[PDB]
Amino acid sequence: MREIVWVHSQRIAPYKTLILNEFCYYPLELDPTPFNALIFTSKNAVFSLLETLKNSPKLKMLQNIPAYALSEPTAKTLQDHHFKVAFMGEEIFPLLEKKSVLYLRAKEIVSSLDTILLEHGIDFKQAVVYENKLKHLTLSEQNALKPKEKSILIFTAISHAKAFLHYFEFLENYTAISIGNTTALYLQEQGIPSYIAKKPSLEACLELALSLR
């Protein structure tokens, strides 16, 4: 029976998981006074604010400014951590028209929401509050993390595929699984085939992995 390995940001017990990246947090230096809307694309920008600004009056201010999110999970994370979540309807770009928006963002270019905002004529500023960065692993750490031969490897984002290939040979006998086509097409650019989950969820990745074990 083939071993199933997650290459992802969080441990999925009891499955072997390779966590090869780490988040680095940067304090928000900007005065948020000019802004009446915040926008987030990742929960990691929320966690960054919570940590670098814990108990600060700056955090209270930020928790008081109506916050918009692009996905439900990010909205729930904001909601769960005492931010003021804006009314988003029973398509958020219209709600942002005539607003001064602060985008709390990753250092790396992923969705380039900045271009999308600029294209919609939204008055916005961006502040980098986190970076998803490759771990510096010791030799010993690497040997412990090397998958067994014939492993099925689940890649949940490009950053994870990239980090894996930085450290480990992709053996012909491994089978790659991609959460969605952006991951899969990155792997294919690297010469690596993979099967893609039927929906881009962790649950669908495991169904696929188990069908192959």
PDB file of C-alpha atoms in Angstrom:
ATOM      1  CA  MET A   1       0.000   0.000   0.000  1.00  0.00           C
ATOM      2  CA  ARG A   2       1.319   3.423  -1.045  1.00  0.00           C
ATOM      3  CA  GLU A   3       1.962   6.166   1.557  1.00  0.00           C
ATOM      4  CA  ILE A   4      -0.139   9.342   1.273  1.00  0.00           C
ATOM      5  CA  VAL A   5       1.825  12.550   2.045  1.00  0.00           C
ATOM      6  CA  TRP A   6       0.398  16.091   2.340  1.00  0.00           C
ATOM      7  CA  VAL A   7       2.591  18.947   1.129  1.00  0.00           C
ATOM      8  CA  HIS A   8       0.670  21.744   2.774  1.00  0.00           C
ATOM      9  CA  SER A   9       0.749  24.466   5.480  1.00  0.00           C
ATOM     10  CA  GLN A  10      -0.783  22.455   8.339  1.00  0.00           C
ATOM     11  CA  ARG A  11      -0.561  18.936   9.706  1.00  0.00           C
ATOM     12  CA  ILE A  12      -3.368  16.621   8.663  1.00  0.00           C
ATOM     13  CA  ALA A  13      -3.241  13.870  11.348  1.00  0.00           C
ATOM     14  CA  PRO A  14      -2.539  10.972  11.134  1.00  0.00           C
ATOM     15  CA  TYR A  15      -1.106  11.493   7.625  1.00  0.00           C
ATOM     16  CA  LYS A  16       2.543  12.363   7.059  1.00  0.00           C
ATOM     17  CA  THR A  17       2.687  16.101   6.266  1.00  0.00           C
ATOM     18  CA  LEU A  18       5.557  18.138   4.800  1.00  0.00           C
ATOM     19  CA  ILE A  19       5.406  21.760   6.006  1.00  0.00           C
ATOM     20  CA  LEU A  20       8.199  23.327   4.010  1.00  0.00           C
ATOM     21  CA  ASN A  21       7.151  26.993   4.058  1.00  0.00           C
ATOM     22  CA  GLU A  22       6.620  29.434   6.898  1.00  0.00           C
ATOM     23  CA  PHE A  23       4.860  32.763   7.330  1.00  0.00           C
ATOM     24  CA  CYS A  24       6.807  35.810   8.309  1.00  0.00           C
ATOM     25  CA  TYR A  25       4.964  38.767   9.835  1.00  0.00           C
ATOM     26  CA  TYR A  26       5.656  42.474   9.266  1.00  0.00           C
ATOM     27  CA  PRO A  27       4.249  45.193  11.535  1.00  0.00           C
ATOM     28  CA  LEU A  28       1.782  47.642  10.033  1.00  0.00           C
ATOM     29  CA  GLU A  29       3.632  50.968  10.105  1.00  0.00           C
ATOM     30  CA  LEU A  30       0.948  53.001   8.289  1.00  0.00           C
ATOM     31  CA  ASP A  31      -1.564  55.213  10.129  1.00  0.00           C
ATOM     32  CA  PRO A  32      -4.975  53.684   9.296  1.00  0.00           C
ATOM     33  CA  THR A  33      -6.905  56.975  10.026  1.00  0.00           C
ATOM     34  CA  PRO A  34      -7.525  57.837   6.303  1.00  0.00           C
ATOM     35  CA  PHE A  35      -9.303  54.508   5.599  1.00  0.00           C
ATOM     36  CA  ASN A  36     -12.968  53.494   5.892  1.00  0.00           C
ATOM     37  CA  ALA A  37     -12.565  50.042   4.322  1.00  0.00           C
ATOM     38  CA  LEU A  38     -10.097  47.212   4.682  1.00  0.00           C
ATOM     39  CA  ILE A  39      -9.685  44.336   2.280  1.00  0.00           C
ATOM     40  CA  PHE A  40      -8.132  40.908   2.838  1.00  0.00           C
ATOM     41  CA  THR A  41      -7.543  37.995   0.449  1.00  0.00           C
ATOM     42  CA  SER A  42      -5.935  35.653   3.034  1.00  0.00           C
ATOM     43  CA  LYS A  43      -6.486  34.669   6.668  1.00  0.00           C
ATOM     44  CA  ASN A  44      -2.707  35.054   7.063  1.00  0.00           C
ATOM     45  CA  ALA A  45      -2.985  38.842   6.825  1.00  0.00           C
ATOM     46  CA  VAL A  46      -5.541  38.706   9.671  1.00  0.00           C
ATOM     47  CA  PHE A  47      -3.239  36.535  11.842  1.00  0.00           C
ATOM     48  CA  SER A  48      -0.339  38.862  11.107  1.00  0.00           C
ATOM     49  CA  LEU A  49      -2.300  41.883  12.424  1.00  0.00           C
ATOM     50  CA  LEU A  50      -3.399  39.978  15.542  1.00  0.00           C
ATOM     51  CA  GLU A  51       0.229  39.072  16.404  1.00  0.00           C
ATOM     52  CA  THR A  52       2.284  42.168  15.501  1.00  0.00           C
ATOM     53  CA  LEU A  53      -0.325  44.538  16.987  1.00  0.00           C
ATOM     54  CA  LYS A  54      -1.676  42.508  19.969  1.00  0.00           C
ATOM     55  CA  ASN A  55      -3.251  44.786  22.635  1.00  0.00           C
ATOM     56  CA  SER A  56      -2.178  47.855  20.589  1.00  0.00           C
ATOM     57  CA  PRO A  57      -4.593  50.731  20.036  1.00  0.00           C
ATOM     58  CA  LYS A  58      -3.755  50.371  16.317  1.00  0.00           C
ATOM     59  CA  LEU A  59      -5.367  46.919  16.307  1.00  0.00           C
ATOM     60  CA  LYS A  60      -8.541  48.235  17.980  1.00  0.00           C
ATOM     61  CA  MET A  61      -8.741  50.944  15.273  1.00  0.00           C
ATOM     62  CA  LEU A  62      -8.344  48.277  12.577  1.00  0.00           C
ATOM     63  CA  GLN A  63     -10.999  46.071  14.198  1.00  0.00           C
ATOM     64  CA  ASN A  64     -13.280  49.116  13.938  1.00  0.00           C
ATOM     65  CA  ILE A  65     -12.902  49.704  10.174  1.00  0.00           C
ATOM     66  CA  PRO A  66     -15.418  47.827   7.980  1.00  0.00           C
ATOM     67  CA  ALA A  67     -13.582  44.827   6.478  1.00  0.00           C
ATOM     68  CA  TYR A  68     -14.200  43.115   3.128  1.00  0.00           C
ATOM     69  CA  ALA A  69     -12.959  39.713   2.035  1.00  0.00           C
ATOM     70  CA  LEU A  70     -12.841  37.842  -1.233  1.00  0.00           C
ATOM     71  CA  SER A  71     -13.712  34.399   0.087  1.00  0.00           C
ATOM     72  CA  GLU A  72     -15.978  32.992   2.813  1.00  0.00           C
ATOM     73  CA  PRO A  73     -13.092  31.479   4.872  1.00  0.00           C
ATOM     74  CA  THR A  74     -11.345  34.856   5.070  1.00  0.00           C
ATOM     75  CA  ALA A  75     -14.660  36.524   6.038  1.00  0.00           C
ATOM     76  CA  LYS A  76     -15.201  33.886   8.753  1.00  0.00           C
ATOM     77  CA  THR A  77     -11.640  34.393  10.059  1.00  0.00           C
ATOM     78  CA  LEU A  78     -12.232  38.150  10.295  1.00  0.00           C
ATOM     79  CA  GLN A  79     -15.586  37.536  11.976  1.00  0.00           C
ATOM     80  CA  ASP A  80     -14.154  35.011  14.440  1.00  0.00           C
ATOM     81  CA  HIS A  81     -11.371  37.380  15.477  1.00  0.00           C
ATOM     82  CA  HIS A  82     -13.451  40.472  16.352  1.00  0.00           C
ATOM     83  CA  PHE A  83     -13.002  42.519  13.176  1.00  0.00           C
ATOM     84  CA  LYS A  84     -15.896  44.590  11.874  1.00  0.00           C
ATOM     85  CA  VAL A  85     -17.132  42.681   8.809  1.00  0.00           C
ATOM     86  CA  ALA A  86     -18.933  44.836   6.217  1.00  0.00           C
ATOM     87  CA  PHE A  87     -22.326  44.020   4.730  1.00  0.00           C
ATOM     88  CA  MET A  88     -21.619  42.086   1.502  1.00  0.00           C
ATOM     89  CA  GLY A  89     -25.143  41.284   0.369  1.00  0.00           C
ATOM     90  CA  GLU A  90     -27.615  38.484   0.510  1.00  0.00           C
ATOM     91  CA  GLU A  91     -19.426  42.066  -6.950  1.00  0.00           C
ATOM     92  CA  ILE A  92     -17.914  43.567  -3.896  1.00  0.00           C
ATOM     93  CA  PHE A  93     -16.164  46.074  -6.061  1.00  0.00           C
ATOM     94  CA  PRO A  94     -19.227  48.265  -6.267  1.00  0.00           C
ATOM     95  CA  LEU A  95     -19.382  48.326  -2.496  1.00  0.00           C
ATOM     96  CA  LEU A  96     -15.828  49.687  -2.543  1.00  0.00           C
ATOM     97  CA  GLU A  97     -16.562  52.519  -4.977  1.00  0.00           C
ATOM     98  CA  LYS A  98     -16.212  55.907  -3.246  1.00  0.00           C
ATOM     99  CA  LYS A  99     -14.267  54.305  -0.339  1.00  0.00           C
ATOM    100  CA  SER A 100     -10.659  54.748   0.921  1.00  0.00           C
ATOM    101  CA  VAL A 101      -9.425  51.148   0.993  1.00  0.00           C
ATOM    102  CA  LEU A 102      -6.468  49.571   2.772  1.00  0.00           C
ATOM    103  CA  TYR A 103      -5.409  46.231   1.338  1.00  0.00           C
ATOM    104  CA  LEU A 104      -3.529  44.105   3.897  1.00  0.00           C
ATOM    105  CA  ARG A 105      -1.532  41.813   1.674  1.00  0.00           C
ATOM    106  CA  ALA A 106       1.215  39.265   1.011  1.00  0.00           C
ATOM    107  CA  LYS A 107       4.639  40.373  -0.200  1.00  0.00           C
ATOM    108  CA  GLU A 108       4.452  37.908  -3.060  1.00  0.00           C
ATOM    109  CA  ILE A 109       2.348  38.484  -6.147  1.00  0.00           C
ATOM    110  CA  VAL A 110      -0.439  35.901  -6.281  1.00  0.00           C
ATOM    111  CA  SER A 111      -3.861  37.256  -7.369  1.00  0.00           C
ATOM    112  CA  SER A 112      -2.563  40.792  -8.125  1.00  0.00           C
ATOM    113  CA  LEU A 113      -5.744  42.257  -6.637  1.00  0.00           C
ATOM    114  CA  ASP A 114      -3.918  45.618  -6.845  1.00  0.00           C
ATOM    115  CA  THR A 115      -4.302  45.596 -10.662  1.00  0.00           C
ATOM    116  CA  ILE A 116      -7.947  44.480 -10.361  1.00  0.00           C
ATOM    117  CA  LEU A 117      -8.647  47.325  -7.899  1.00  0.00           C
ATOM    118  CA  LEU A 118      -6.846  49.866 -10.119  1.00  0.00           C
ATOM    119  CA  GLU A 119      -8.899  48.617 -13.101  1.00  0.00           C
ATOM    120  CA  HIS A 120     -12.116  49.211 -11.130  1.00  0.00           C
ATOM    121  CA  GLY A 121     -10.995  52.775 -10.243  1.00  0.00           C
ATOM    122  CA  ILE A 122     -10.888  52.079  -6.486  1.00  0.00           C
ATOM    123  CA  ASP A 123      -9.016  54.519  -4.206  1.00  0.00           C
ATOM    124  CA  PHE A 124      -6.675  52.134  -2.354  1.00  0.00           C
ATOM    125  CA  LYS A 125      -3.345  51.748  -0.571  1.00  0.00           C
ATOM    126  CA  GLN A 126      -1.509  48.422  -0.023  1.00  0.00           C
ATOM    127  CA  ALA A 127       0.560  47.318   2.948  1.00  0.00           C
ATOM    128  CA  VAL A 128       2.584  44.110   2.990  1.00  0.00           C
ATOM    129  CA  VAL A 129       1.956  42.415   6.360  1.00  0.00           C
ATOM    130  CA  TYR A 130       3.231  38.907   5.632  1.00  0.00           C
ATOM    131  CA  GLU A 131       5.385  36.714   3.426  1.00  0.00           C
ATOM    132  CA  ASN A 132       5.158  32.986   2.745  1.00  0.00           C
ATOM    133  CA  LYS A 133       8.784  31.926   2.803  1.00  0.00           C
ATOM    134  CA  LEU A 134      10.819  28.736   2.212  1.00  0.00           C
ATOM    135  CA  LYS A 135      12.029  27.059   5.437  1.00  0.00           C
ATOM    136  CA  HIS A 136      15.770  26.645   5.972  1.00  0.00           C
ATOM    137  CA  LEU A 137      15.937  22.929   6.774  1.00  0.00           C
ATOM    138  CA  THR A 138      18.973  21.166   8.206  1.00  0.00           C
ATOM    139  CA  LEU A 139      20.282  17.976   6.589  1.00  0.00           C
ATOM    140  CA  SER A 140      18.802  15.951   9.413  1.00  0.00           C
ATOM    141  CA  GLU A 141      15.385  17.638   9.000  1.00  0.00           C
ATOM    142  CA  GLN A 142      15.490  16.873   5.245  1.00  0.00           C
ATOM    143  CA  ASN A 143      16.215  13.148   5.693  1.00  0.00           C
ATOM    144  CA  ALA A 144      13.305  12.822   8.145  1.00  0.00           C
ATOM    145  CA  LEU A 145      10.932  14.517   5.695  1.00  0.00           C
ATOM    146  CA  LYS A 146      11.971  12.660   2.520  1.00  0.00           C
ATOM    147  CA  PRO A 147       8.906  10.667   1.338  1.00  0.00           C
ATOM    148  CA  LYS A 148       9.208   6.892   1.052  1.00  0.00           C
ATOM    149  CA  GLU A 149       9.421   5.618  -2.510  1.00  0.00           C
ATOM    150  CA  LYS A 150       6.103   5.207  -4.393  1.00  0.00           C
ATOM    151  CA  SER A 151       4.475   7.865  -2.117  1.00  0.00           C
ATOM    152  CA  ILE A 152       1.405   9.760  -3.252  1.00  0.00           C
ATOM    153  CA  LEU A 153       2.091  13.490  -2.728  1.00  0.00           C
ATOM    154  CA  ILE A 154      -0.726  16.032  -2.302  1.00  0.00           C
ATOM    155  CA  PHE A 155       0.224  19.572  -3.331  1.00  0.00           C
ATOM    156  CA  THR A 156      -2.201  22.173  -1.981  1.00  0.00           C
ATOM    157  CA  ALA A 157      -0.614  25.301  -3.534  1.00  0.00           C
ATOM    158  CA  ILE A 158       2.204  26.343  -5.885  1.00  0.00           C
ATOM    159  CA  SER A 159       4.408  27.506  -2.981  1.00  0.00           C
ATOM    160  CA  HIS A 160       4.326  23.931  -1.647  1.00  0.00           C
ATOM    161  CA  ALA A 161       5.242  22.355  -4.995  1.00  0.00           C
ATOM    162  CA  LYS A 162       8.058  24.895  -5.380  1.00  0.00           C
ATOM    163  CA  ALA A 163       9.434  24.211  -1.882  1.00  0.00           C
ATOM    164  CA  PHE A 164       9.215  20.462  -2.385  1.00  0.00           C
ATOM    165  CA  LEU A 165      11.208  20.618  -5.624  1.00  0.00           C
ATOM    166  CA  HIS A 166      13.772  22.883  -3.971  1.00  0.00           C
ATOM    167  CA  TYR A 167      14.632  20.105  -1.517  1.00  0.00           C
ATOM    168  CA  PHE A 168      13.681  16.758  -3.027  1.00  0.00           C
ATOM    169  CA  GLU A 169      14.014  14.885  -6.291  1.00  0.00           C
ATOM    170  CA  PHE A 170      10.650  14.072  -7.776  1.00  0.00           C
ATOM    171  CA  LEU A 171      11.021  10.337  -8.288  1.00  0.00           C
ATOM    172  CA  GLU A 172       9.265   8.855 -11.323  1.00  0.00           C
ATOM    173  CA  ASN A 173       7.482   6.438  -8.941  1.00  0.00           C
ATOM    174  CA  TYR A 174       5.902   9.241  -6.876  1.00  0.00           C
ATOM    175  CA  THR A 175       2.371  10.212  -7.863  1.00  0.00           C
ATOM    176  CA  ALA A 176       1.523  13.929  -7.585  1.00  0.00           C
ATOM    177  CA  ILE A 177      -1.929  15.193  -6.757  1.00  0.00           C
ATOM    178  CA  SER A 178      -2.878  18.828  -7.318  1.00  0.00           C
ATOM    179  CA  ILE A 179      -5.666  20.646  -5.502  1.00  0.00           C
ATOM    180  CA  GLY A 180      -6.529  22.573  -8.713  1.00  0.00           C
ATOM    181  CA  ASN A 181      -5.103  23.445 -12.140  1.00  0.00           C
ATOM    182  CA  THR A 182      -2.958  26.392 -11.084  1.00  0.00           C
ATOM    183  CA  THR A 183      -0.919  23.959  -8.949  1.00  0.00           C
ATOM    184  CA  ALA A 184      -1.077  21.238 -11.603  1.00  0.00           C
ATOM    185  CA  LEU A 185      -0.005  23.543 -14.444  1.00  0.00           C
ATOM    186  CA  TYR A 186       2.916  24.823 -12.389  1.00  0.00           C
ATOM    187  CA  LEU A 187       4.017  21.206 -11.816  1.00  0.00           C
ATOM    188  CA  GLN A 188       3.577  20.447 -15.531  1.00  0.00           C
ATOM    189  CA  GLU A 189       5.811  23.460 -16.374  1.00  0.00           C
ATOM    190  CA  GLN A 190       8.403  21.667 -14.220  1.00  0.00           C
ATOM    191  CA  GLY A 191       7.872  18.458 -16.246  1.00  0.00           C
ATOM    192  CA  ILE A 192       5.784  16.824 -13.531  1.00  0.00           C
ATOM    193  CA  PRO A 193       2.417  15.182 -14.239  1.00  0.00           C
ATOM    194  CA  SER A 194      -0.296  15.118 -11.589  1.00  0.00           C
ATOM    195  CA  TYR A 195      -3.930  14.207 -11.118  1.00  0.00           C
ATOM    196  CA  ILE A 196      -6.269  16.981 -10.074  1.00  0.00           C
ATOM    197  CA  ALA A 197      -8.918  16.856  -7.331  1.00  0.00           C
ATOM    198  CA  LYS A 198     -12.547  17.064  -8.568  1.00  0.00           C
ATOM    199  CA  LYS A 199     -13.120  20.199  -6.429  1.00  0.00           C
ATOM    200  CA  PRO A 200     -10.307  22.328  -4.992  1.00  0.00           C
ATOM    201  CA  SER A 201     -10.698  21.142  -1.393  1.00  0.00           C
ATOM    202  CA  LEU A 202      -8.508  19.086   0.948  1.00  0.00           C
ATOM    203  CA  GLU A 203     -11.366  16.589   1.167  1.00  0.00           C
ATOM    204  CA  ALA A 204     -11.428  16.020  -2.605  1.00  0.00           C
ATOM    205  CA  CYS A 205      -7.612  15.660  -2.593  1.00  0.00           C
ATOM    206  CA  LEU A 206      -7.854  12.801  -0.111  1.00  0.00           C
ATOM    207  CA  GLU A 207     -10.671  11.039  -2.016  1.00  0.00           C
ATOM    208  CA  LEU A 208      -8.429  11.109  -5.080  1.00  0.00           C
ATOM    209  CA  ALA A 209      -5.362   9.972  -3.090  1.00  0.00           C
ATOM    210  CA  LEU A 210      -7.265   7.078  -1.489  1.00  0.00           C
ATOM    211  CA  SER A 211      -8.609   5.895  -4.861  1.00  0.00           C
ATOM    212  CA  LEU A 212      -4.948   5.416  -5.830  1.00  0.00           C
ATOM    213  CA  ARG A 213      -3.457   3.869  -2.681  1.00  0.00           C
TER     214      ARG A 213
END
